[PDB]
C-alpha cells in the first residue's frame, strides 16, 4: 500500500493558469512585447517562472541584464499575487477535498509538490493548509524542466521514499518528473498531452482513494 500522495497544485487542487497568463501578458505589454496570447500560455505549461520570462523576452529578441531579468520576474509575480488574493475554498477542484479527507482518515501522508512558490498562500486561501503533512519548497530544489527534485523532496518531507508514493500531475513535464523520482504518476487531462504508460483520468472527480488503491495494486509486481 502506498504511504503518501504527492499533490501538484495547478491543474490538480485548483488552477490559477488564467491568472499566471494575465500577469505574464500584462508584463509583456508593459515592456512593449506583443504576442503573449492564450495559446502562448499553453507553451508555458510545465515551465518555470524564469524560463517563462525568457520565452517572452525571446518573442521580441529583447536583451536585458541579469538584474533587470530578476526585476521583471518579480514584477510579474507581484501582479500574479494581487490576482490570486480572491482565491477561496470554492476554487478547490471537484473531488479533491474528499480525497484529502479520505487520505487523512487512513493515515496516508499528504505532501504538496507544486512548482509554484505561491503554493502555501494558495492552500491558505482554499482553507487546505492543515490537510498537508508537508509542503516541498520549490525555492530549495531544482526548477529545471521535468526535474524530479520537488517530488523527491515532497516524499522525504513526510518520511517516505518516492517509490512508496503516488504523484498527481496535469503536465507532461510533471509526469516525467514523477516517473524519474520513482513515484507512481496518475495524470489528469488528455493522453495526447501527458504521455504513455501511465494511468490518466479525464478530471479530478476520478481521483478517489478507491481508484488510487486499485491503480497502485495494478502497478505492483
Ligand atoms: O506545478 P504546479 O502546482 O502546477 O504550478 C505550476 C506553476 O509553477 C511555476 O513554474 C512557478 O510558479 P510561481 O511563479 O507562482 O512560483 C509556474 O510557471 C507554473 O505555472
Ligand atoms: Mg500543474
Ligand atoms: Mg507541477
Ligand atoms: Mg467521468
Author numbering: 1 to 221
From the paper:
Allomorphy is a post-translational fine control mechanism where the catalytic rate is governed by a conformational switch that shifts the enzyme population between forms with different activities. β-Phosphoglucomutase (βPGM) uses allomorphy in the catalysis of isomerisation of β-glucose 1-phosphate to glucose 6-phosphate via β-glucose 1,6-bisphosphate. The active site of βPGM is located in a cleft formed between the cap domain (T16–V87) and the core domain (M1–D15, S88–K221), and these domains reorient in response to the binding of a phosphodianion group in the distal region of the active site30. Allomorphic control of βPGM involves the isomerisation of the K145-P146 peptide bond situated within an allomorphic control loop, which leads to either fully active cis-P βPGM or partially active trans-P βPGM.
The dominant population (72%) was assigned as the trans-A βPGMD10N,P146A:F16BP:MgT complex (BMRB 51986), in accord with the crystallisation experiments. The second species was assigned as a trans-A βPGMD10N,P146A:F16BP complex (BMRB 51987) without MgT. From the populations measured and the concentration of Mg2+ (5 mM), the MgT dissociation constant was estimated as Kd (MgT) ~ 2 mM. Both complexes adopt a NAC I conformation. An additional magnesium ion (MgT) is coordinated between this water molecule and Mgcat, providing charge complementarity in the neighbourhood of the 6-phosphate group of F16BP. Again, further closure towards a NAC III conformation appears to be obstructed by steric clashes between the carbonyl group of V47 and both the axial 2-hydroxyl group and equatorial 3-hydroxyl group of F16BP. Overall, these results indicate that NAC I conformations are preferred for F16BP complexes irrespective of the isomerisation state of the K145-X146 peptide bond. The observation of MgT in the same site within the trans-A βPGMD10N,P146A:βG16BP:MgT complex, the trans-P βPGMD10N:F16BP:MgT complex and the trans-A βPGMD10N,P146A:F16BP:MgT complex indicates that its accommodation is correlated with a trans K145-X146 peptide bond.
